Design a protein around this ligand. Sequence first.
Ligand SMILES: *CC[C@H]1/C(=C/c2[nH]c(/C=C3N=C(/C=C4\NC(=O)C(CC)=C4C)C(C)=C\3CCC(=O)O)c(CCC(=O)O)c2C)NC(=O)[C@@H]1C
Ligand SMILES: *C[C@@H](*)[C@H]1/C(=C/c2[nH]c(/C=C3N=C(/C=C4\NC(=O)C(CC)=C4C)C(C)=C\3CCC(=O)O)c(CCC(=O)O)c2C)NC(=O)[C@@H]1C
Ligand SMILES: *C[C@@H](*)[C@H]1/C(=C/c2[nH]c(/C=C3N=C(/C=C4\NC(=O)C(CC)=C4C)C(C)=C\3CCC(=O)O)c(CCC(=O)O)c2C)NC(=O)[C@@H]1C
Ligand SMILES: *C[C@@H](*)[C@H]1/C(=C/c2[nH]c(/C=C3N=C(/C=C4\NC(=O)C(CC)=C4C)C(C)=C\3CCC(=O)O)c(CCC(=O)O)c2C)NC(=O)[C@@H]1C
Ligand SMILES: *C[C@@H](*)[C@H]1/C(=C/c2[nH]c(/C=C3N=C(/C=C4\NC(=O)C(CC)=C4C)C(C)=C\3CCC(=O)O)c(CCC(=O)O)c2C)NC(=O)[C@@H]1C
Ligand SMILES: *[C@H](C)[C@H]1/C(=C/c2[nH]c(/C=C3N=C(/C=C4\NC(=O)C(CC)=C4C)C(C)=C\3CCC(=O)O)c(CCC(=O)O)c2C)NC(=O)[C@@H]1C
Ligand SMILES: *[C@H](C)[C@H]1/C(=C/c2[nH]c(/C=C3N=C(/C=C4\NC(=O)C(CC)=C4C)C(C)=C\3CCC(=O)O)c(CCC(=O)O)c2C)NC(=O)[C@@H]1C
Ligand SMILES: *[C@H](C)[C@H]1/C(=C/c2[nH]c(/C=C3N=C(/C=C4\NC(=O)C(CC)=C4C)C(C)=C\3CCC(=O)O)c(CCC(=O)O)c2C)NC(=O)[C@@H]1C
Ligand SMILES: *[C@H](C)[C@H]1/C(=C/c2[nH]c(/C=C3N=C(/C=C4\NC(=O)C(CC)=C4C)C(C)=C\3CCC(=O)O)c(CCC(=O)O)c2C)NC(=O)[C@@H]1C
Ligand SMILES: *[C@H](C)[C@H]1/C(=C/c2[nH]c(/C=C3N=C(/C=C4\NC(=O)C(CC)=C4C)C(C)=C\3CCC(=O)O)c(CCC(=O)O)c2C)NC(=O)[C@@H]1C
Lengths: 160, 160, 160, 160, 161, 161, 161, 161, 161, 48, 68, 48
Amino acid sequence: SVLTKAIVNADAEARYLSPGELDRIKSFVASGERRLRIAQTLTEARERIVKQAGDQLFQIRPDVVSPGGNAYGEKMTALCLRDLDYYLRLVTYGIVAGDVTPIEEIGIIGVKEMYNSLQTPIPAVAEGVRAMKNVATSLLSGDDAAEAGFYFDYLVGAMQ
Amino acid sequence: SVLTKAIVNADAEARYLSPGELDRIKSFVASGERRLRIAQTLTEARERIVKQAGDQLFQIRPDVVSPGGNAYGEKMTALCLRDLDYYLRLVTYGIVAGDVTPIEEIGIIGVKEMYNSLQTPIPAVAEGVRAMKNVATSLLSGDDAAEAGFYFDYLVGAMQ
Amino acid sequence: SVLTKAIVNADAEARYLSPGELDRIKSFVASGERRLRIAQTLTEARERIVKQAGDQLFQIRPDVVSPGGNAYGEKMTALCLRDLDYYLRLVTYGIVAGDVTPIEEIGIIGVKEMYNSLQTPIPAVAEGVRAMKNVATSLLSGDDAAEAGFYFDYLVGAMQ
Amino acid sequence: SVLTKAIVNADAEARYLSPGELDRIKSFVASGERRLRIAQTLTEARERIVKQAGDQLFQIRPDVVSPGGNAYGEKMTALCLRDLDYYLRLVTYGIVAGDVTPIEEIGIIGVKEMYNSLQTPIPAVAEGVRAMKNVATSLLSGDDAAEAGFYFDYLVGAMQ
Amino acid sequence: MQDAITAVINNYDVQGKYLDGAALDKLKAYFTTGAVRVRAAAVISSNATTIIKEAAAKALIYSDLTRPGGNMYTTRRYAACIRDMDYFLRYATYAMLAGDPSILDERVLNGLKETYNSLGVPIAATVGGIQAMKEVVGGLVGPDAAKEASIYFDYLSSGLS
Amino acid sequence: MQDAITAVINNYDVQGKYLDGAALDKLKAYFTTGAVRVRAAAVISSNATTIIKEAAAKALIYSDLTRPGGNMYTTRRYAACIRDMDYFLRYATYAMLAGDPSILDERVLNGLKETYNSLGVPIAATVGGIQAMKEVVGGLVGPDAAKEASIYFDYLSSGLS
Amino acid sequence: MQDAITAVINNYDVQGKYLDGAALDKLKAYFTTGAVRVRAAAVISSNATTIIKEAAAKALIYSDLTRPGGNMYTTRRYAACIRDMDYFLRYATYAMLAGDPSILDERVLNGLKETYNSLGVPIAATVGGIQAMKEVVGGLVGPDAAKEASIYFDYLSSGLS
Amino acid sequence: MQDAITAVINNYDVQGKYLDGAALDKLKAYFTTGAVRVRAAAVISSNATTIIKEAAAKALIYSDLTRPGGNMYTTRRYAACIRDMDYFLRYATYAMLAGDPSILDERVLNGLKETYNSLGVPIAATVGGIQAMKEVVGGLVGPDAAKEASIYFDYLSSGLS
Amino acid sequence: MQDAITAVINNYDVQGKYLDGAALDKLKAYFTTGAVRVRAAAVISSNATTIIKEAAAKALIYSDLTRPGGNMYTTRRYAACIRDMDYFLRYATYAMLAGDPSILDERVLNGLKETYNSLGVPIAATVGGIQAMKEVVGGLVGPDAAKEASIYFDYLSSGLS
Amino acid sequence: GQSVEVGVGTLRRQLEHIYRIAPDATRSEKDVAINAIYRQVLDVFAGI
Amino acid sequence: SRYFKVTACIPSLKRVRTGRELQNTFFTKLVPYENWFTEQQRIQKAGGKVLSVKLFTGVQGANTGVGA
Amino acid sequence: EDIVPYRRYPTLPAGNYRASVRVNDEELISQSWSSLSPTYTGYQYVTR
Ligand SMILES: *CC[C@H]1/C(=C/c2[nH]c(/C=C3N=C(/C=C4\NC(=O)C(CC)=C4C)C(C)=C\3CCC(=O)O)c(CCC(=O)O)c2C)NC(=O)[C@@H]1C
Ligand SMILES: *C[C@@H](*)[C@H]1/C(=C/c2[nH]c(/C=C3N=C(/C=C4\NC(=O)C(CC)=C4C)C(C)=C\3CCC(=O)O)c(CCC(=O)O)c2C)NC(=O)[C@@H]1C
Ligand SMILES: *C[C@@H](*)[C@H]1/C(=C/c2[nH]c(/C=C3N=C(/C=C4\NC(=O)C(CC)=C4C)C(C)=C\3CCC(=O)O)c(CCC(=O)O)c2C)NC(=O)[C@@H]1C
Ligand SMILES: *C[C@@H](*)[C@H]1/C(=C/c2[nH]c(/C=C3N=C(/C=C4\NC(=O)C(CC)=C4C)C(C)=C\3CCC(=O)O)c(CCC(=O)O)c2C)NC(=O)[C@@H]1C
Ligand SMILES: *C[C@@H](*)[C@H]1/C(=C/c2[nH]c(/C=C3N=C(/C=C4\NC(=O)C(CC)=C4C)C(C)=C\3CCC(=O)O)c(CCC(=O)O)c2C)NC(=O)[C@@H]1C
Ligand SMILES: *[C@H](C)[C@H]1/C(=C/c2[nH]c(/C=C3N=C(/C=C4\NC(=O)C(CC)=C4C)C(C)=C\3CCC(=O)O)c(CCC(=O)O)c2C)NC(=O)[C@@H]1C
Ligand SMILES: *[C@H](C)[C@H]1/C(=C/c2[nH]c(/C=C3N=C(/C=C4\NC(=O)C(CC)=C4C)C(C)=C\3CCC(=O)O)c(CCC(=O)O)c2C)NC(=O)[C@@H]1C
Ligand SMILES: *[C@H](C)[C@H]1/C(=C/c2[nH]c(/C=C3N=C(/C=C4\NC(=O)C(CC)=C4C)C(C)=C\3CCC(=O)O)c(CCC(=O)O)c2C)NC(=O)[C@@H]1C
Ligand SMILES: *[C@H](C)[C@H]1/C(=C/c2[nH]c(/C=C3N=C(/C=C4\NC(=O)C(CC)=C4C)C(C)=C\3CCC(=O)O)c(CCC(=O)O)c2C)NC(=O)[C@@H]1C
Ligand SMILES: *[C@H](C)[C@H]1/C(=C/c2[nH]c(/C=C3N=C(/C=C4\NC(=O)C(CC)=C4C)C(C)=C\3CCC(=O)O)c(CCC(=O)O)c2C)NC(=O)[C@@H]1C
């Protein structure tokens, strides 16, 4: 989280937390209630977001649901939907944590070898994440929607 | 400033800025005019805070203005008051910058070696700075007083 | 000592002793009886140097035995005298050793942190050791005194 | 051996064997029976080769079997002959291996300090190895003579 | 290491679960405790040397530890002991900020007892100094953060002991 | 390196002056344009590889540079050029975020002209690729930060040329 | 490490013996199967990623290991497991080429059991995966090198178990 | 480096000559002044920080060097300049003990000039400080070692200028 | 480590005692034998390789150690053995010069027994060789330093065994 | 007058970091520390 | 091809370093045979303690396939 | 043992400061390692 990042940066120089690294903690604790509300709101609409994002992803890239596609078949599409649910959970984790830090260890480092050895389209996963971002921003206020879209764009660059 | 500390980490890790860095920059930039108004009062009371700080410092320990003291003599006392004015200026710089980069690069690195060469009591200088903190906090609203007290606290901690 | 440091570079280079190291050790063992007589005279007289050094140091800087000074208390001045006794002993050890490494590993490296924690005037301690040097050389012959003063002003230099 | 060298390089670069390494392995396995025949011939002629090499070495350098010679005397000469037999065994080992790795680990590294401690002439050992090579090539076909002489010249260079 | 938020996130990720109200109240508690920790941390930063100068006086110095034959004897050992003491103070501050002793376990207690046994350091004396700083910090910070500060010093003392 | 705030603070430190109305006006001028810089930076970070792809396709590739004997010929040189492109983009993002060209002056432009002259790199092609990523950046970021992002790309192109 | 030739050479050099008929027979026995080892190694190198993919599909994935709470859970742990499997494949190929499990003992099995115990790695699942890779390799290589490939996979599985 | 003795020894070894009357005369000339060099070196070692402080007071501080815009200004530059003065004093002591400016050329003078030009250090002010420190050292040592101590300081000043 | 002088100094510094008559007598006893120690060390340094050569000829070589199956067989292992012999000789010379086995304990025997156990080196053969150079050094040095030289070789043999 | 940057930079001490590895301190910090090793030894000034 | 598994405790007795230095003092590490000599001898030249060693990788017979 | 190396710019060796500042952070790496595809340097332009 932001606290972990600041503590790591301070410990690396063997000093105490400067004032420049305390106002950020104050801002983080101030925005914590809004971040928790955003994460709970995203968690309430988890199934609708996943289904709608999957529909948009399939419309945009029908090749994946084609015979030569990684997600060809009912169970292969269910696995894609479960992966989208995993990434939505990771996004809500990042939003509550305030820093993206856990998401790196959870699902972006090694994700290239994930989808390479599973032969899955990483750009298709990116499009699915973008559809999830659209569905999420459709159910939030402007500042909450922008705050969630920051982490969604972070994932879209992270599997890039 | 906050920008320098948020950019040096990104340059060290060879990556674009993380969302925690972005929204910490938003706390910093949103608090900008308030930071300016906080620093303006201390500049208005520049030569008025230093005089009261000197009296409290000399009341707490008068031996520095004693014949065996480092500040004995009118010009020696004037030099000490000028150093206190220097540190007040650095405190205003740090308050407007939002971090401690200017204060650190101007007046805390090598300060121990230089004051040891001059044989000046560093613990005495710390109390002199704390008197400035009290005088400054007497002239500000509570939240702004705490905000400036964070930088005075950092100076006192780094001085010892 | 001499054999220790020479053996240090000898083992660093993985070789036997050079002729210069050998004749240097030869001169060292040649000067041994004079060194022993030096240290013997000081350890024999050890107490008068301690008390006269304390008196001279307090005369030069009475602020240490002033109310805001580090040496108020009979037991608190006893600690300063015991420190002087310690440093006189280390001077005798260095005199018999033929350089200064036991002195450094006993009371030189870390001594600045030592006295900075206690907020004791390091130049005042150096003044005390210097005043110790004069009353020490007062009880020695012309050539004995210079040899003792070499280690005494070594301690004076190392304290600053 | 060639297999050992190829596997070591492949593991060091963290990859499978290169086409060149595969081709050299194929060539070595093709030449294996010829190498076995050459080694069998040298093993069968091990004693006469050692005797003749000792004879040429003694004719070339009588000083070694002179009073100021390392191999002066019957048992000092027998030790030199046993060393020549050891080198013949290692030469056969290298010829069957296809490289010089066993040869090295067995007698070439440390041999300089070996004959320095024993005060034995390394150039004289090289000359004995050369007369040994002449005797060995006297009992082999031209291609096999060249193949054995490559290892013999490797040994001659190693004693240098 | 891991703060409260990261610990909760990791514990829920290990089940693969979205965050619920039970973890939400725990996060709310830390968000309520945020300001007092920040205010308490700066005070310790300002009075770090002063805090050390009293715990050492009340627990270590003026005893056989500081005399010849003591572990704290000689300037090198005294400087090392005070540097260790500052290490404990700073990492206790980090633990009190992060709301978890994970960093204390990761960066201080790991191998410290074995190194101290190898070097002859008095574990009882170190625990006494840690408790002395705990008393001093509890006095300085006030009722608001005294317990929170004290629990990590107790954690360090228990880990060493 | 320095940003706008540290630049003004240092510029008054060198004169030994307390910060006044002009300095605070410069500071508030930096603060008011804050959010556009981060939104440009976040969009740029999300669209980095697309920017490099579009810049290469519209400024370098499908030419004699990629054909044999050219500079960009061979996979090694192509990877080197794309890495340099990404480097320039990232450091221009840093300069835009900091509001200062000093980061580019120290960590990018220093010796690059002479090194490219020694290695045979096409400076005109480099400037064209820089302008290409500047165009794609102005397109992506929108009206909020397109101009601000454009100034530092122009700075890099001018420093190289 | 050591191959068959090096093993014979060291077993004779420890006795200080010239090579005799028995050692010649062992050397000839190794030489008679050189080409089949080369072709099997080439096939394995050409199909390394495919063998790992089908081995993972048959033994590891679609289970609790890839779910939360599984050792294989999360992309980092998954890539660690598959990188270990590729290590197993490459070192099995090395052992098959050299005709000796000395390299397998030296660079793979040494401490791997204790490492997996400390990390929580499922030894049974790893054995199942390596056995699946052995089956796939035996299918791919053909009759000429099936047993030669399978003996070193069984050696690795026995060392792990 | 080399002293007078080593310089004569090398100057005779280059001709392959045994020591003659002239070499013995030079050696005797150096030997006759050994004690004064040791006394001056011990005095300088004892008064090292005091000499630096008075040199700074007479030559550097209370000027534009110590105000905003001076090279001495700011704590880091103050510490750097005093460390430079300490280096000069130590190497001057080495030169006086060795009776040869070869150590000054090898370990002090090379690189220092253009290093100061690149850094912006005022060479004239440094030379003036070195000369004032020379005056203080000559005052402390006495007539016996005054000129022999002064000559190496003039060597340093001439090498800088 | 420590010599006789430093050992006495530390043994009194730990007790907080000045140098008394007993310490002066111990120091005088060490001082009276200084020249003979220097002579023995110079003789051993001048005759280093001869001592190791004769010790090897008397205790190690012409045995099963130098033949196949031996630990000292092969040029590399023989080099290791004679390098160890030379190190034992030089450290014994240092111990005899310093009048204390502290250097032998700190820089020779620390972990050497377990290292030889792990490597397979013969402890009894090494002890016999060490006794061999002990005999040779005792023969070379003469009555003056024979016992003092021999005591540290005995110390090395006792520590190894 | 000469400012802070006119001295020996102000960027070379900020730009230098000390990485330990901290054996039980998370894959992200471990990867950053390892990437620093590459950027130091085998230049890789992109850092990856 | 031989890697010792060694464990040492090096006490710093010259500087009193102010930052970290725990892993630098107490550490267990694999070291190759080629450099273990200099590593051990540096350890004992720094007043260190060689608590434990292991052979780990190589064979104790040696003299072939060893000096790679 | 346990920290990654970094740029230093030493001071003590009397010229090592300027040598270090020149060798790193003032001069980069020329002379690309491979000798297979030399650049003919005649095409600096990408006009189309
Ligand atoms: C509370 C006052 C204490 C005190 C101070 C004291 N200072 C000096 C002399 C100097 N102080 C400075 C200071 C600075 N230079 C910088 O760049 C900065 C950072 C902004 C500072 C703070 C300098 C350079 C000097 C040297 C003189 C000069 O400025 O030209 C003195 C005089 C010492 C002398 O020998 O003349 C004193 C007494 N003394 C005390 O006792 C107080 C604790
Ligand atoms: C939008 C869906 C895309 C897609 C996906 C797809 N995935 C699989 C199989 C797996 N996916 C995972 C994923 C994860 N494990 C983790 O730890 C994380 C981080 C939280 C993730 C995202 C795993 C482990 C598997 C393997 C099976 C299992 O879960 O046990 C498949 C099936 C592939 C197959 O060969 O059967 C698919 C198709 N496919 C698309 O076309 C979309 C782009
Ligand atoms: C109150 C002081 C007590 C004491 C301590 C003491 N410690 C040492 C030496 C070391 N202590 C450490 C500690 C740490 N390193 C770390 O990184 C951390 C956590 C971040 C810790 C806690 C280490 C590594 C050493 C060894 C290296 C060094 O000296 O720096 C010593 C010196 C021992 C010696 O002389 O060899 C002392 C004296 N001694 C007391 O009496 C107190 C109880
Ligand atoms: C669009 C790309 C153009 C191009 C580039 C090109 N560059 C190289 C090689 C190097 N580039 C650098 C760059 C830097 N060093 C630094 O310090 C910085 C800033 C911090 C930069 C940007 C360096 C050091 C090299 C050489 C070492 C290396 O390869 O990493 C090459 C390779 C040339 C060769 O093979 O010799 C190319 C091709 N070429 C084009 O045609 C484009 C216009
Ligand atoms: C008479 C020779 C006997 C013998 C010895 C032998 N020793 C080794 C290996 C080592 N010896 C050392 C020695 C030292 N460590 C130290 O710190 C110092 C002083 C600085 C010494 C003298 C060490 C560390 C090793 C291991 C690394 C190395 O080999 O250099 C060996 C080699 C064992 C092997 O082949 O692996 C031998 C053979 N062997 C005999 O048969 C004699 C009795
Ligand atoms: C005396 C001339 C000056 C002075 C001294 C002073 N010292 C103390 C307290 C201590 N001094 C030591 C010293 C040493 N420990 C060592 O191992 C060595 C090396 C041999 C030394 C020199 C220590 C450890 C202490 C702490 C108490 C203890 O020994 O257990 C004090 C008391 C400080 C206090 O706060 O009570 C004083 C006053 N004070 C002066 O003014 C003189 C210049
Ligand atoms: C064909 C079977 C597959 C395929 C290929 C494809 N390539 C490009 C474009 C380029 N390919 C290269 C390649 C090289 N440059 C080199 O120096 C070397 C080493 C000798 C290689 C291999 C380059 C430089 C380009 C860019 C254009 C240019 O050469 O100037 C394309 C076009 C991509 C586009 O966006 O237009 C394609 C399609 N595509 C497939 O699907 C096949 C598997
Ligand atoms: C994969 C089939 C199974 C599995 C494995 C797994 N391993 C790790 C971590 C490590 N694996 C190693 C491996 C080796 N050490 C060696 O010396 C060699 C030979 C060169 C090997 C193969 C090591 C050292 C580690 C730790 C360091 C590292 O990660 O690189 C993990 C990750 C554990 C973690 O998250 O910390 C995993 C998952 N897991 C399964 O479920 C499979 C049965
Ligand atoms: C012969 C051409 C030259 C020569 C040799 C010579 N050697 C010795 C004694 C020894 N030689 C060895 C050699 C080896 N041991 C090994 O393990 C290997 C690797 C296979 C070799 C080569 C050894 C160990 C000895 C010591 C005795 C023993 O083995 O038990 C001597 C005797 C020296 C003495 O002082 O007695 C001699 C003379 N002398 C010449 O003149 C030739 C040039
Ligand atoms: C002091 C009287 C004046 C002054 C000096 C000043 N110097 C530097 C920086 C450096 N000085 C050196 C010098 C040496 N290195 C050597 O090895 C030797 C001989 C053994 C010398 C003399 C070097 C190399 C540097 C650069 C590295 C460093 O800064 O330490 C500074 C500061 C540089 C900076 O801030 O970056 C200063 C201020 N300044 C004055 O005002 C005096 C006139």
